[PDB]
């Protein structure tokens, strides 16, 4: 019917819910509010940083879904307050919505590491949103002195695509070899264990040295080594156990939470992530808004691009049929995060989820999913890189379309 | 239980919206014989067909879901993967295909929706098919005894140049 659904945010999650909604029943005018021109991906940016992928490759327009019956008004949302179902944006526009899909991403919390700021980002970069940021870090790695040390500092708790820091360390290490088995990646982490750890370690052993300590990657555990609340353009970071690591390129990855607009609107809870209903992704706080995967609390679904896409669908379907018809049904969601470690070595973790029993509770269907077995043969590791690319090419087409 | 389309939504990530994979290596699974689909899918599940990940994926679904799903993929239209084939070889492929594969690989191995049974090979992504054969020649995948013979002894009267020629020919069929 002639409905307006407003989708705030037009990245993986937002875009997926936008097109699939228009797609699902073309009489609904779907407006997609997004501050900017281009979507730079981040799910394969570390390959730009490693040097094999041009930054051009991960830039993507809205022309696709736009020319698909979606009005892409480039503007930042500013407020949203329900009751009288309006959405306001930094320049004077208020769009009425019958239902709204908020998909803002991660707000990074600079504060948490005293020394770091919004303006420190430009010199010591978290490339955890991509574009410009990925380029800074690439310039710094191209600019590093052979011998130069790079440190990478994972937050902990919930962050976006967990193997991210370690695939970055692999990609970086992959490059550094350009500067002679003479350089070093140092990861100062906030956690005891980590995602696809044994496969990551086996990989590192195999490629960049690792037990050898005539090795190019060093992993330093956590909470101790959690790079806290100090770093400075003296080019030093200081962990929570007070050691000082001086390094030529440091990449601080700050703690994250639901994007800002989710906080203005009232969608976050105690943790600073938005509570959603697992069947339809409608907010358990304000009705008529659906928040998707990053900014939402989705039981073990890792905060990833894939998860965003899936949820996007469950959302798209959930609203459109709920919007103007009847009772939506049950869903299945899926995730797999891929990590390429060297052009020929790739691993993956994959999982299938289902509304476990009844109500809110997403639980992986038992006996399924997993990550590339550690005893994987050459062909698996070699093939997976190609299936990683394929996953990329396909998901950025499924999504903007 | 979810609709076929709910379950099939979540595969778009790796082999295209509707099963038609964009580059460079995932298989398109759009027009797929629903019978071949549960065989393969349940094979992946059991481990008998060597996968890099589909055994992990497959193991979370069960036969009826493979049926809802094959029901869902059967109605799509397959789209040939536009990729580069060899001209000089495109030809020789055809010839060799008749003489060794044509028995079961229906009219260039195309997705003929000719009611039942067929193995789609025209317009499928070359890297995949190259891998496909590797799992065969190496005995990672169950291979039917005639499928073998023609490949295993006969095709190899041409040697690897043979397979090259076949790979170029299925790719010309766009
Ligand atoms: C950065 C990173 C993340 C990764 C990753 C590696 C890195 C280095 N690797 C991944 C991988 O291999 N596989 C994956 O499946 N994902 C990976 N990811 C995860 C990550 O990229 C995804 O989680 C993420 O892109 C998708 O999450 P999302 O859909 O929730 O959000 P987004 O960042 O994609 O876009 C949100 C969108 O919202 C816009 N926006 C913000 N605030 C507003 C307002 N006020 N109004 C309107 N628009 C607004 C924002 O600009 C952004 O485009
Ligand atoms: C990426 C993480 C995948 C997801 C999610 C799904 N599939 Fe998949 N599929 C993928 C690859 C890389 C391959 C090759 C096999 C391997 O693991 O090495 C495939 C292949 C298939 C096939 C076989 C097609 C053929 O030509 O023989 C089928 C039947 C298939 N995939 C089905 C399928 C379905 C129904 C999924 C959604 C639930 C699904 N796949 C997800 C990678 C990925
Ligand atoms: C008749 C029996 C044959 C012959 C003469 C050939 N093939 Fe094909 N093939 C056949 C079957 C029943 C199957 C399924 C697997 C099984 O044996 O259980 C296949 C499958 C393929 C595939 C893989 C398809 C996929 O899953 O994507 C390929 C790539 C393939 N066959 C190729 C092929 C070629 C090149 C042949 C001529 C030398 C050939 N086959 C012969 C059955 C038969």
Swiss-Prot record, chain A:
The enzyme's first-digit EC class, named in words, is oxidoreductase
Q: Where does FAD bind?
A: 40-46
Indicate where this protein is primarily found. Answer: periplasm
Q: What is its EC number?
A: 1.8.2.3
Keyword check for Hydrolase, yes or no. no
Q: Where in the cell is it found?
A: Periplasm
- Return the InterPro entries for the record: FAD/NAD-bd_sf, FAD/NAD-binding_dom, FAD/NAD-linked_Rdtase_dimer_sf, FCSD_central, FlavoCytC_S_DH_flav-bd, FlavoCytC_S_DH_flav-bd_sf, SQRD, TAT_signal
Q: What is this protein called?
A: Sulfide dehydrogenase [flavocytochrome c] flavoprotein chain
- What is the protein's species of origin? Allochromatium vinosum (strain ATCC 17899 / DSM 180 / NBRC 103801 / NCIMB 10441 / D) (Chromatium vinosum)
Query: Gene symbol?
Result: fccB
From Swiss-Prot, chain B:
Binding of heme c 1 occurs at: 11, 14-15, 54
Keyword line: Electron transport, Heme, Iron, Metal-binding, Periplasm, Signal, Transport
Gene3D superfamilies tied to this protein: Cytochrome c-like domain (1.10.760.10)
- Provide a Gene Ontology MF annotation, just one: electron transfer activity
Q: Which PROSITE patterns match?
A: CYTC (PS51007)
Where is the protein situated, by its record's location annotation? Answer: Periplasm
> What does its PTM field state?
Binds 2 heme c groups covalently per subunit.
Where does the UniProt entry say this protein principally localizes? periplasm
Gene Ontology terms: cellular component:
periplasmic space
Residues annotated as binding heme c 2: 101, 104-105, 143
**UniProt keyword Signal, yes or no:** yes
> What role does it play?
Diheme cytochrome that function as the electron transport subunit of sulfide dehydrogenase.
Q: How does it assemble?
A: Dimer of one cytochrome and one flavoprotein.
* Name of this chain's protein: Cytochrome subunit of sulfide dehydrogenase
UniProt lists the gene as fccA
